[PDB]
Design a protein around this nucleic acid. Sequence first.
DNA 1: GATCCTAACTAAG
DNA 2: CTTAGCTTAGGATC
Lengths: 669, 791
Amino acid sequence: DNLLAAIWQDSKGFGYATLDISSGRFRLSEPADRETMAAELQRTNPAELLYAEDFAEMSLIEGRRGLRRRPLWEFEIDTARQQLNLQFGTRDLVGFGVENAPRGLCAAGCLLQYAKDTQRTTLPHIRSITMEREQDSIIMDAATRRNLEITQNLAGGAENTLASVLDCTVTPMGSRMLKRWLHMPVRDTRVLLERQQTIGALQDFTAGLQPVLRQVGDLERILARLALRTARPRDLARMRHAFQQLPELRAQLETVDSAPVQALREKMGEFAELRDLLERAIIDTPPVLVRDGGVIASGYNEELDEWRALADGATDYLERLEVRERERTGLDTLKVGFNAVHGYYIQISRGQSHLAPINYMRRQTLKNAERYIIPELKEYEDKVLTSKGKALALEKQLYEELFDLLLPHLEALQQSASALAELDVLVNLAERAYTLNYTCPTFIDKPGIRITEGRHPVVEQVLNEPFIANPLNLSPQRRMLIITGPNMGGKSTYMRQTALIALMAYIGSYVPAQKVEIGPIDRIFTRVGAADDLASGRSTFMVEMTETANILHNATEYSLVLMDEIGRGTSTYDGLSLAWACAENLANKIKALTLFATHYFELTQLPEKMEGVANVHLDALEHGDTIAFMHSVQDGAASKSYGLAVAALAGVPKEVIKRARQKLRELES
Amino acid sequence: DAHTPMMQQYLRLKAQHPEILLFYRMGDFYELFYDDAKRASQLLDISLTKRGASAGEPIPMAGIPYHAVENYLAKLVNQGESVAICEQIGDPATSKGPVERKVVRIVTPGTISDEALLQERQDNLLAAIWQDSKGFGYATLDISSGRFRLSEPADRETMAAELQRTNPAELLYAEDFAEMSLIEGRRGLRRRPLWEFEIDTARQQLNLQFGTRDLVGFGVENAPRGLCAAGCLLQYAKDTQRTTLPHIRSITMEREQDSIIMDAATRRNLEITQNLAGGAENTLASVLDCTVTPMGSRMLKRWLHMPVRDTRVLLERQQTIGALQDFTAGLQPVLRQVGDLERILARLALRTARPRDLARMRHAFQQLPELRAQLETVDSAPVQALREKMGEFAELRDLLERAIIDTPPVLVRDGGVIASGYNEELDEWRALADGATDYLERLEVRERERTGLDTLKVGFNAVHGYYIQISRGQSHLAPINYMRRQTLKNAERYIIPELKEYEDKVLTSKGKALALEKQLYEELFDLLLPHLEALQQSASALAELDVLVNLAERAYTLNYTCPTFIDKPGIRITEGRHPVVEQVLNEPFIANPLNLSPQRRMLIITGPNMGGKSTYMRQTALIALMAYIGSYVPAQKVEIGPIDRIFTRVGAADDLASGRSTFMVEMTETANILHNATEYSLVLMDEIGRGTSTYDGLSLAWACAENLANKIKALTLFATHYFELTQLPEKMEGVANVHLDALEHGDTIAFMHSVQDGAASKSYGLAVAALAGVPKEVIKRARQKLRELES
DNA sequence: GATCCTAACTAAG
DNA sequence: CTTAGCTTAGGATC
Ligand SMILES: Nc1ncnc2c1ncn2[C@@H]1O[C@H](COP(=O)(O)OP(=O)(O)O)[C@@H](O)[C@H]1O
Ligand SMILES: Nc1ncnc2c1ncn2[C@@H]1O[C@H](COP(=O)(O)OP(=O)(O)O)[C@@H](O)[C@H]1O
């Protein structure tokens, strides 16, 4: 009725745009597949649709109403980015989070040009352009995925990350499954509850299953390499070892009562005929490269054994012929050797070399020993050389026939691998749950997070000092906590453990706290750290404000926002002013479950000034030169940073601290 | 106390040296334990591992090989972290407890900005000198202290300078010393035998005295000429004292030339090779790495991260960059064809080269004569040396051209890799094998006409050998002579005694040909191997040549100019630009003058946000680094005085664990600056006191700057949005205000990007946030609040 | 007195 | 790319 929309196509994917003239909501989508395009067009019900002249799939477009064939110049990549930036008055669209989306921006440029064509009126309604994601998974921007340190810390090391604490998974194919899960938080309650039940039920039988799962091996990538018919023999030997161990895994899982544990038990399968084939057709320990040979176990084919028996018959006949030739010639120095260049030979000392009979013919010649070829030996060596090659060639042919026999079940083996990988993450999540004293979360139907005896998993485990437990109550009635406290007080640790508890709750895992009440959460936003992209023309402040803009644009009521102290990298007064307005918009309008840690103590008045907002104070007491921190979240607002005290513990010289305290006396007066 | 015997010994040795990252020799591998591992891991980029637990949780361990120490040891000391190298002094045999370890050497940051390192009046300095083809080897022993120094100079100037610097009380020279003139001035001159300067006797004599098995820990094992001198000196120490002295327990390196010390934080804050995002793109290296040869790419990235202070080396690069500038376009194409000579030769060294790689070796030797000829025309002392050092290796050119096919397959097992006619035998057996393919067709014709079957086609299966495949229609028509071995739906495969005898010839010829090639492909490595030493020198020279022509091409392309060395603390830049930003951004970079000096030691760079405060601050260092890697700087004129340390502290991020807060790390790293900094050191600071409350941050900043000026006297650029510290210049001498400015014409703000004298009073934050993309609703309330806050 | 895991590279496919 | 090969000590438990 008022949803003027644009569509445009490129070879890789298609681009959709929607402008609400009435609302001023400007939205952007990039749906590559046709089903989503049809669904989104039906969902929107565009009042008028613009359609590129050069669009191939006319069928999708032809059904829609208010159809307009539009020129290609309106769908230009460059003209769109500048036209939108000019209207907004910005230099880049990185703040809106649409800069990276080209196809939608193309559509948006044509729509903005058609917005002028339709109205040409005042356009203050168009200040922003959002990108609506259809994942139905918690959407975490790459900035957050490194700020919370989910899998990668700020230094870039795999150590001191959430994944490190929760990745005791015994199979390397399960390590990848969990790291997939941590970055893709399933938002549907029904799936998380199945994992939660399975984690709780397997908790009894963790110790029994975890050892048997280790023996499976990296089955996922072995199947992928088998699919490309380039598995190599040590990999097929790992497939055999798994099929040996699957029956044990099935039996232990039979005892475990849960319906999904029974489904994974049945989905794992047996594949006993493949167990039989690999056991029959591969030697206990083959080499890693097939071209070398020694891969095919004796019993698989009769013909391999016949030619291998000729080759084995050659190696005994080598010693038997060496003994009979040594006795018949009467030469003790007579020794039989195989040089690849000159084939099999008879090497005698030069002293007895001329005494070797006429049948002996020098193929290889050295001064110290002479290497001869008897005609009987030559007939046998020709037999050895032709058998050696045929055996190697047959080995490769059978090693291909094995692929052909194993290939049909690959579909079910892939399902088996997915199930066994899933099981290892689940029994790993059951082990860490019991080992680290985690609990099961519950899902209330309304956005909010209620934590009792809440702990930051990484810090508490990797610091040899008791973590003081912190209670949290974020709800629709209490949407913001201004966490103001002394430096090293725990204001930023208390802030971050809210979102790591929230994330772990949403990949189906047990959580650090004693009790959790996690409501629905759509996105986890953070502004933490500091950096300057001088090469991409962004000062340290701009990058900070670009990420504050991402939050202020794309945050909803259902979103958890964890802003660190902001307004840093401008003058005192200017930073405080921007921080007050940022927090107000996050509370009075956005209504996001927010923790706003600030060393600025003027913002401690915001709960009195605004509704549905509260203050909390991680406190410390300054006894002597040293400062003692409580590490305890208590209600109220801390008035003092004790920065000059936290600098003395940092190692700043006493001379510098003394003058700074003398200056603080003057500054306060 | 309650730990394992070895970790007990580690902790009591670790207790002696509290902040010193201690290298502990656990058999083959030096490795750091507990916190020192986590210090080692994030600096040296070795993999952190958890070894078996000792009276608690597992021990975090981070290790290196014994012979790669000096490579890593350099990367540690150049980031400021002093290394405590701890050898196995005791025998690992007859040690039921841990092998006894003692801290033989403490390699400091190596700050040698002070002109009088060794005093001129310092006597009882018994010294030794010996010379070979490569250069001189000098040693100095102070017997009274037992303090030992070891130097191996490359040119006469350093030898004369070091002899003058030391002023040895007694000098032991050698029977064969060529440049007698340098040592003629030196007092207590003694002509000494060659056996006292034998390399083998020197290594055991030093090891025996210190009680070690190797000198790799002291970092002198690899250095032969100095060790020869040290052996004669140590032998003459026994001769003079007629005793062994425990004072002389160690041998350090006197010729440790101070690379400008840059902590790992700075090496990523300047983005020398790795930007803050971690990508190879938008780094200094990216701008200066258009080097055509992969062997050269790693050479300049090595150079960028070791900015050497020695003027002699920088001048050789400066001259060669200027001289080759004419023949950039001529040499750069010919250098590309050489290939990665570094990596091919490394494969030749392990005797495990692919034949495709030896074909790339041939291609280089083809192109080397052309390179020498072009370089002959360019007359310069180092360009002629690199021209001669490159070499020809014509006999290897001949061998590879004779013994490798124009384009060989990727493995030798593939076959045909060895060029026919290098050996008579290979072509004779290959000719027998080639005899098969015509014999195939000639019996496919003779059998087709004798049988009279037109559909008859002869084929070879690997499993069933050669066969006679005939359609089922003509399969029953095939004669009795034909014997069906292999049976298919559309065709029957027969066999003839002539095809069992011929196929045996084809399969024994095929194998013999393949076996001979492998043998020859090994004989080639034996013939090429002797010259590897000189080929390695050639590779080092060709790599060096390519960074120099790249730097020469980029110098002319980007209009860079030769820098000047005042040799008095100061920096004097006119028309300088940030190399990365102007190259990687469409808009012309506005050039900026800088005038640091002893009279003007501090500039409080206060300006609007994104005014160019941080680029002007880094631009100083990147110009300074490029000047000390002997490259042409981005400028019109530069007079860079001595710098021992570039400190950078722009922005902070917290681990949020293990006692780290945004504030904790900022104060700890300003602490590093406030203690380690010298009058020679360049300090760069952005708004220290960001991670703490308003009044506490200003107070700490005013004390930090005062100490940096009134005491440390460091060439400092103190960027601050705090405008209270703009008053510091009046209070203390040698501090001045500077203002990167911008003009607000309308709602939008234009940044001038020009360093002008004065102090800007206003930070245009709310305006630079609107251009960042913060919603207008947020900006409007923030401006309304700023009105209230200011009032 | 003995017995597992450990630390940089290499490079074939 | 890329997933497989790459080294002297330690330590206990009688
Ligand atoms: N709840 C807590 N219990 C115990 N220690 C804590 C707690 N919260 C933080 N810490 C400790 O505080 C230090 C980090 O403080 P941090 O919150 O980063 O300071 P700031 O709030 O000023 O940014 C670390 O030693 C960390 O272990
Ligand atoms: N001289 C110049 N000419 C053109 N662009 C410049 C110049 N100096 C800086 N810039 C650009 O403007 C930005 C300067 O911001 P910066 O100096 O980092 O500010 P801040 O000190 O607040 O961090 C950089 O991103 C750079 O791309």
